[PDB]
Amino acid sequence: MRVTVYGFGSLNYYSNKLNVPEKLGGEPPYGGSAMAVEFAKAGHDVTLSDPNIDKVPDEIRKKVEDAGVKLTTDDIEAAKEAEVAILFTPFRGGVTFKIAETILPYLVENAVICTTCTMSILVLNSYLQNAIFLEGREDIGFSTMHPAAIPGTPQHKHYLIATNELLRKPIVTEEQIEKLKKLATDTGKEAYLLPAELVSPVGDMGIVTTAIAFAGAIEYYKVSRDILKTKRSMTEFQIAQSLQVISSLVTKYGLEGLIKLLNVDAMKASLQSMILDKNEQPLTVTASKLLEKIEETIPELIKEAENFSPSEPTYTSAPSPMLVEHMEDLVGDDVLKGILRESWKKFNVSERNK
Amino acid sequence: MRVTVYGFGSLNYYSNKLNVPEKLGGEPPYGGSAMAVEFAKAGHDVTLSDPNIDKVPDEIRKKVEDAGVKLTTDDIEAAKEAEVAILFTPFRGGVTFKIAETILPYLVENAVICTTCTMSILVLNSYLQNAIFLEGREDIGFSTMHPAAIPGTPQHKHYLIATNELLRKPIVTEEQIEKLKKLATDTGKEAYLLPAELVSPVGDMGIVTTAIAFAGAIEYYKVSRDILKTKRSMTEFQIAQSLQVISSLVTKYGLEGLIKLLNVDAMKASLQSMILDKNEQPLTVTASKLLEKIEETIPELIKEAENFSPSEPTYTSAPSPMLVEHMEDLVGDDVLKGILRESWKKFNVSERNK
Numbered sequence: 001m002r003v004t005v006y007g008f009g010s011l012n013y014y015s016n017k018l019n020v021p022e023k024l025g026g027e028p029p030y031g032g033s034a035m036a037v038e039f040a041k042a043g044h045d046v047t048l049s050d051p052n053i054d055k056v057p058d059e060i061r062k063k064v065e066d067a068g069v070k071l072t073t074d075d076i077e078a079a080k081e082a083e084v085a086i087l088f089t090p091f092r093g094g095v096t097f098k099i100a101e102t103i104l105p106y107l108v109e110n111a112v113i114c115t116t117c118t119m120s121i122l123v124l125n126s127y128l129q130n131a132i133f134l135e136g137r138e139d140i141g142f143s144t145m146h147p148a149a150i151p152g153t154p155q156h157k158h159y160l161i162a163t164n165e166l167l168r169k170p171i172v173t174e175e176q177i178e179k180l181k182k183l184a185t186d187t188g189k190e191a192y193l194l195p196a197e198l199v200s201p202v203g204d205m206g207i208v209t210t211a212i213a214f215a216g217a218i219e220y221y222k223v224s225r226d227i228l229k230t231k232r233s234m235t236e237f238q239i240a241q242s243l244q245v246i247s248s249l250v251t252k253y254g255l256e257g258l259i260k261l262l263n264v265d266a267m268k269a270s271l272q273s274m275i276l277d278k279n280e281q282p283l284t285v286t287a288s289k290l291l292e293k294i295e296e297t298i299p300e301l302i303k304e305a306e307n308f309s310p311s312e313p314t315y316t317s318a319p320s321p322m323l324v325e326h327m328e329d330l331v332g333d334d335v336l337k338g339i340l341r342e343s344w345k346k347f348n349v350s351e352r353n354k
Numbered sequence: 355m356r357v358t359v360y361g362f363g364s365l366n367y368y369s370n371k372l373n374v375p376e377k378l379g380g381e382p383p384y385g386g387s388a389m390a391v392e393f394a395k396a397g398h399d400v401t402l403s404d405p406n407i408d409k410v411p412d413e414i415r416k417k418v419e420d421a422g423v424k425l426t427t428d429d430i431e432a433a434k435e436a437e438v439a440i441l442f443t444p445f446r447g448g449v450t451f452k453i454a455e456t457i458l459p460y461l462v463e464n465a466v467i468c469t470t471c472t473m474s475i476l477v478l479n480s481y482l483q484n485a486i487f488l489e490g491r492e493d494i495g496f497s498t499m500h501p502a503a504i505p506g507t508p509q510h511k512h513y514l515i516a517t518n519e520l521l522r523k524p525i526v527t528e529e530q531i532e533k534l535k536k537l538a539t540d541t542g543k544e545a546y547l548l549p550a551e552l553v554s555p556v557g558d559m560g561i562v563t564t565a566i567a568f569a570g571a572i573e574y575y576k577v578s579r580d581i582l583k584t585k586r587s588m589t590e591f592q593i594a595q596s597l598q599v600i601s602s603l604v605t606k607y608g609l610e611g612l613i614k615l616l617n618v619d620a621m622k623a624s625l626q627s628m629i630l631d632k633n634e635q636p637l638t639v640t641a642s643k644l645l646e647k648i649e650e651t652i653p654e655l656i657k658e659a660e661n662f663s664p665s666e667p668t669y670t671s672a673p674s675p676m677l678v679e680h681m682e683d684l685v686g687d688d689v690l691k692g693i694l695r696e697s698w699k700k701f702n703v704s705e706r707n708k
């Protein structure tokens with residue numbers, strides 16, 4: 001199939017800033033370039049478009065070209081025969097939007113546009129609605145080829161592919177998803193099909209918080225089921241509440257607010273009474289140990305927390321899905337969609353140091 | 355001061371169901387009874403009201419009475435001179451509401467009603483609004499004496515006391531809070547003053563999820579700051595999103611939905627690329643290890659997840675505080691308060707096994 005990868009990947013970031021050969025493995029080139037080489041080795045007709053191809057050293061460029069990858073700096077020309085367009089584009093503001101809007105009229109009929117860790121597919125799909133109406137591109141599909149790893153490292157053994165699950169309207173077809181699954185299996189990677197909204201919390205760097213919180217909830221569920229002998233309904237309410245509260249505090253008041261309002265000393269004290277089976281509670285015990293010296297590890301945050309004051313009140317435990325249902329019933333989806341747009345932009349209050 | 359503790363504490367639960375002397379320490383009686391004995395030893399005029407005082411063994415009853423605690427089965431008479439009324443009442447439906455509504459006209463002027471781990475003070479305060487209007491008890495204060503531990507165990511060294519912080523309207527006065535702080539310091543306990551909405555996620559059994567997720571977010575913040583060298587705004591967005599998503603999934607689809615939709619295999623794979631400094635990432639490493647055998651530990655949930663299907667779509671990442679602000683602007687608080695009522699009731703979809 002004809003695949004165009006947009007973005008080589010930052011050579012300096014993966015070599016000097018984050019020592020990827022040392023911390024994870026493999027050798028440069030990492031990122032979009034590695035993805036392209038793999039698709040080309042599988043026998044796909046691959047093009048890699050990047051405006052800075054001339055800054056790539058000759059030895060690395062030659063290695064990429066030898067695999068069969070066609071290199072170019074022309075994004076529009078690179079889109080012309082593309083059945084799959086993968087955006088390995090900057091975190092930087094507006095670069096991904098610009099590229100997607102520019103290639104949109106040139107992609108082949110039924111082409112699918114895929115984002116990676118730097119852009120939510122839902123944010124991109126929403127941003128392009130008027131362009132789709134104007135260019136009559138309702139045939140274009142939207143999904144992801146999220147590596148949830150750095151391509152070129154031994155850890156990259158899969159791709160997270162966004163599906164229509166949990167969405168009100170579809171953004172991709174079954175045929176398009178099959179093409180993405182094939183790109184993954186043709187290159188020896190496991191294809192993980194997830195609801196589109198979950199690709200980011202599962203694939204991005206936040207997987208650390210996602211997995212620790214999820215593992216912590218299962219640990220609390222096992223203590224509740226086996227030791228406290230409490231009701232499932234009570235256990236699920238406690239998990240939902242704890243996580244909604246922390247999320248609300250970080251969103252509204254930042255990490256400094258989260259720390260000042262929850263009270264680390266209180267959490268540490270309270271947690272002592274839930275250490276009921278040391279052998280069956282690895283995370284509780286590990287977390288308790290961390291809370292003991294937490295102030296030495298994050299002095300900069302402890303200082304912000306000491307100078308923090310909540311500017312206005314809020315309902316930290318209000319369950320989002322319940323507020324979402326009420327809002328949808330009261331004003332409808334389009335009106336509600338003009339909220340998930342303002343959230344991702346923060347990736348405002350953070351800028352103003354709030 | 356005159357304090358009335360409502361509820362002895364369940365002798366069978368703390369001795370046979372949860373082996374408290376073995377798992378935590380100390381000796382029976384645990385709970386409300388222990389709290390009463392401590393306030394009586396400090397020199398307070400203490401009354402303990404419980405309908406089942408005659409079921410308490412004589413030796414345990416004698417030990418309580420010897421400390422100066424007045425035992426009774428009459429809740430109304432027990433309220434008559436009470437400056438502080440502490441509800442160490444059942445998790446069981448409507449028992450706490452009944453007692454609070456019944457003693458409300460008899461408490462002394464400016465008395466404060468305190469809940470413990472079995473009832474949110476905000477839920478109770480909301481439920482009693484018409485009774486307060488009718489009995490002209492706008493002088494009554496609402497707060498907590500949450501042990502965030504089992505009173506009588508060596509771990510119980512503090513109390514969580516609800517304040518007006520983060521609330522739109524106050525529920526307690528400074529004088530009332532000072533009385534609670536005194537009950538705590540008079541009995542050698544640390545007084546932890548928290549915003550009323552945070553007493554439950556910090557004090558209740560959910561502290562396991564609260565502390566693991568919080569510790570996990572700080573661990574991810576340190577990896578982001580020191581190793582990835584990414585922006586604070588990006589880090590806080592990732593923490594907020596991860597936790598909002600997990601909370602939304604558990605609230606709407608239960609633990610079985612959470613497990614099926616996030617995909618444990620995907621989370622485990624993705625997490626491998628964020629293990630960047632083993633020595634500085636205890637929770638990531640511990641969580642990764644747990645995900646490896648997670649299916650053997652919770653087969654009952656893995657089976658529900660296999661038979662799970664989302665009934666309707668939702669926005670799992672919608673930030674609650676943003677939806678709260680919009681709702682408050684669109685319909686006002688009273689209209690919005692008729693939502694936090696339906697949430698706590700679940701402590702519906704859970705009952706229907708959804």
Ligand SMILES: Nc1nc(=O)c2c([nH]1)NC[C@@H]1CN(c3ccc(C(=O)N[C@@H](CCC(=O)O)C(=O)O)cc3)C=[N+]21
Nearest residue numbers: 091092117148149203204205583584585624625627628
């Ligand atoms: N499951 C998984 N998902 C990931 O998404 C993932 C991972 N594992 N392992 C490590 C790579 C690395 N990573 C970065 C995050 C932010 C910046 C970032 O903020 N870069 C800025 C500037 C960085 C700088 O110059 O210091 C930028 O490109 O604009 C970079 C790299 C996430 N990764």
Ligand SMILES: Nc1nc(=O)c2c([nH]1)NC[C@@H]1CN(c3ccc(C(=O)N[C@@H](CCC(=O)O)C(=O)O)cc3)C=[N+]21
Nearest residue numbers: 229230231270271273274445446471502503557558559
């Ligand atoms: N920081 C902290 N906060 C706590 O709130 C806390 C703690 N540590 N350590 C352990 C005690 C124990 N605990 C229970 C939770 C639910 C039931 C429960 O659901 N009981 C049911 C029935 C129990 C049965 O009969 O099996 C009931 O009373 O109706 C009991 C006990 C929370 N505790």
Ligand code: NA
Nearest residue numbers: 201206592596
């Ligand atoms: Na996230």
Ligand code: NA
Nearest residue numbers: 254255353354
């Ligand atoms: Na902040």
Ligand code: NA
Nearest residue numbers: 321322605606
């Ligand atoms: Na809901």
Ligand code: NA
Nearest residue numbers: 238242555560
């Ligand atoms: Na909780």
Ligand code: NA
Nearest residue numbers: 608609707708
């Ligand atoms: Na459930």
Ligand code: NA
Nearest residue numbers: 251252675676
């Ligand atoms: Na907000």
